[PDB]
């Protein structure tokens, strides 16, 4: 027989459709709405990414149908046939749906009926194919059945299209509604209305036990709210099916897999279709590119059993009920708590996968006799076991979940006769550098070494890398910092590039950039709530900074994600203001001095902020360093700094410094540096001196050569 897949059926639990092997359907998408069918070659690549399914946005609907000259359904048939044929012979599943195009959150009822009058009987016999009635027919979620739904009548469209499909394809799985925003216990309650209205029409009774149907939903409420809505709906007896979602790594400023929601959907037993495309083309991000899928799975510790290939690797958490270890928690609106991760509870999975050890035997013999890591009993406070026989090159991964991002005290309980080296990365990103661990003088003589780290939010593998041997490891600890990165107080914010401040506007509760006028609207109380996170409130009325559909100010207190801001030091006296939600940094746009925005980390001055006492002197701006013709001379010029008596010109040979002060008492906004060596790069900054008080250094100026 052919490798064509057997018809999906609801699982015993009644949570989703699973394939002919009892496993969830997991896949990316492709479109044939205004483009050719993706080639066999590229659709095949799906199987190497642990996918067994493809989402097809088949055609997009015309609002004007069936007026003269409007595009009818059927126009893409020759390409949709190719996708059906190609997924058939690749042993993949296929979810076919009607796309929206430019008309998002909308549908045409008659276009959809005639779409399924055509396509339903055409693929009825195709066991690997499922029908999802329509992508996001309403703006933007339940209840569709409300008269004030935008637009109304979607439930009637679903009812009509289900009846059309069952006539022409009685065995074929149907995915309903495709709620764009499906969030909260509210979301589930509102969907139940639409589900009950649907069931009363089709089956005659508000509560029907579906044998071959499920609620399709998307992830645009966010992972927390979507998970709550799915849990609730599953409890009411209705299988679900994720058909479109996205997230990305915290701090990337880009899309890709929502790792957090995938983990929750894996736990609840829910099949999913992520919104990354099969090459060559698509409207979002390419699923074959590491940054948008494979690396995100690889960095997080996420695992499932793939239908084809050997990725992802089989792995999991040891202890803690097989669930990623939480790092901190909110207790009286302050981020606190110490999580102890025992070193001998490294993830299971294998040698080369969840740990690397130099041999396959546990020479110590304790705790985990079937694995390669070397474990003995320890005589340290709290008893238990320690990882010993640590050779250089070895490593141990522990899957954790940093629900609250920011600054954490990372602690290693260590013993060793002599010193040793280690390095810790989180999500395959170095957070420590080379960490010199002290000599204790014995192999059960214990001490705690501690180092401060900046963790991003989400599932992430903590990985101890042993750069030297000769130490034993008992446990690891993370707790959020109890003392902040900057003292509590009232401050003025000045952007490093342009010297501008942030100002409250009570009339529309907005925050906008302006020149530091010295007023209370441009003054801000700062209060640390654990983890380097801060509540930032205006001085005049006690209203808190809020990053949500713009950048404004609100009455409710700051423990929710939009009202919380990580103040992250640069190292050179400035800070960047990281947003707790996505990990992007608050910056003024180099391009438009008025526009405030959130972008991913870069070296530029426009992303950096001075958080200063109100009376502190302003730093210089606009520094520009240019080489003079035919000679060793750098001509510096900058803008005059308010209240400056003089300037100090400083120079370094790499970006960021340190900066050796080449000249002081400059009573002018320009300088000529004669001591520049032939054909070498130089980096300049300038500070001002106001009433004996030296300011911060300006933004860096790279020495500019000729064309
Ligand atoms: Ca071993
Ligand atoms: Ca070992
Ligand atoms: Ca231990």
Author numbering: 36 to 742
Give the original sentences from the paper that presented this experimental model.
The GH5 arabinoxylanase (CtXyl5A) derived from Clostridium thermocellum displays an absolute requirement for xylans that contain Araf side chains. In this enzyme, the key specificity determinant is the Araf appended to O3 of the Xylp bound in the active site (−1 subsite). The dockerin domain recruits the enzyme into the cellulosome, a multienzyme plant cell wall degrading complex presented on the surface of C. thermocellum.
To explore further the role of the non-catalytic modules in CtXyl5A the crystal structure of CtXyl5A extending from CtGH5 to CtCBM62 was sought. Using this construct (CtXyl5A-D) the crystal structure of the arabinoxylanase was determined by molecular replacement to a resolution of 2.64 Å with Rwork and Rfree at 23.7% and 27.8%, respectively. The structure comprises a continuous polypeptide extending from Ala36 to Trp742 displaying four modules GH5-CBM6-CBM13-Fn3. Although there was some electron density for CtCBM62, it was not sufficient to confidently build the module. We postulate that the reason for the poor electron density is due to the CtCBM62 being mobile compared with the rest of the protein. In the structure of CtXyl5A-D, the four modules form a three-leaf clover-like structure. CtCBM13 acts as the central domain, which interacts with CtGH5, CtCBM6, and CtFn3 via 2, 5, and 4 hydrogen bonds, respectively, burying a surface area of ∼450, 350, and 500 Å2, respectively, to form a compact heterotetramer. The interactions between CtGH5 and the two CBMs, which are mediated by the tip of the loop between β-7 and α-7 (loop 7) of CtGH5, not only stabilize the trimodular clover-like structure but also make a contribution to catalytic function. Central to the interactions between the three modules is Trp285, which is intercalated between the two CBMs. Thus, any perturbation of the loop (through the removal of CtCBM13) is likely to influence the electrostatic and apolar environment of the catalytic apparatus, which could explain the reduction in activity associated with the deletion of CtCBM13.
